[PDB]
Amino acid sequence: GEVPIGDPKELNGMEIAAVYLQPIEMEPRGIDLAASLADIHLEADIHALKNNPNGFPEGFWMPYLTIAYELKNTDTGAIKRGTLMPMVADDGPHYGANIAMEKDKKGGFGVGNYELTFYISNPEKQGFGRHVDEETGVGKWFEPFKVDYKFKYTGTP
């Protein structure tokens, strides 16, 4: 059910990919946009690479990230921004948001060419700690960064 968004990027010890699927229903209620109001569920799939410098085992989900997105229709110039929220689905933990496309009451988010940007800040922003002792410590976290994708939105799946 998942449509790839552009090509994944490897950086800061992480594999960072984007996909969209049909709208999902999330609990708790009142956080994620309700499925009937949305056209897609956008997901950031973020996992540790080999030799992750912050101690995360290869393939582990990267938790406690702060992630904002910007979605730009490059045909219309229409831009929207939001946050992705941490949650779990059948395919495990990720960061996600239901997003109105055709249903965006502002308009301009229908079928077309898009640029997607993630803006990502490290887990310390949320108070997640790291050992820094000689025996068990790990390296410094990345500074906030962005990653960019280009994709064609072909309509609510």
Q: What residues make contact with Fe ion under the rule CB under 5 A? A: 43, 91
Residue 86 CA to residue 143 CA, distance in Å, equals: 20
The residues near 145 (Cβ < 8 Å, ≥ 6 apart) are 11, 12, 119, 120
Residue 49 in contact with residue 61, Cβ under 8 Å?
no
Binding mask 92-131 for Cl ion (x = CB under 5 A): ----------------------------------------
Residue 146 in contact with residue 120, Cβ under 8 Å?
yes
- By CB under 5 A, name the one of 6, 8, 53, 112 that touches Cl ion: 6
Residue from 145, 140, 138, 146 nearest 124 by CA: 140
**24 counts as binding a second copy under rule CB under 8 A:** yes
Select the binding partner of residue 7 from Cu ion, Cl ion, a second copy, none (C-beta < 5 to 8 A, by kind).
Cl ion
Binding mask 114-153 for a second copy (x = CB under 8 A): ---------xx--xxxxxxx-xxxx---------------
List residues bridging with 89 in a β-sheet.
92
DSSP structure class, residue 102: T
Residue 83 CA to residue 99 CA, distance in Å, equals: 10
- By CB under 8 A, name the one of 5, 19, 32, 73 that touches a second copy: 32
Chain positions contacting a second copy, by CB under 8 A: 1, 21-22, 24-28, 31-32, 35, 54-57, 60-61, 63-64, 85-93, 96, 123-124, 127-133, 135-138
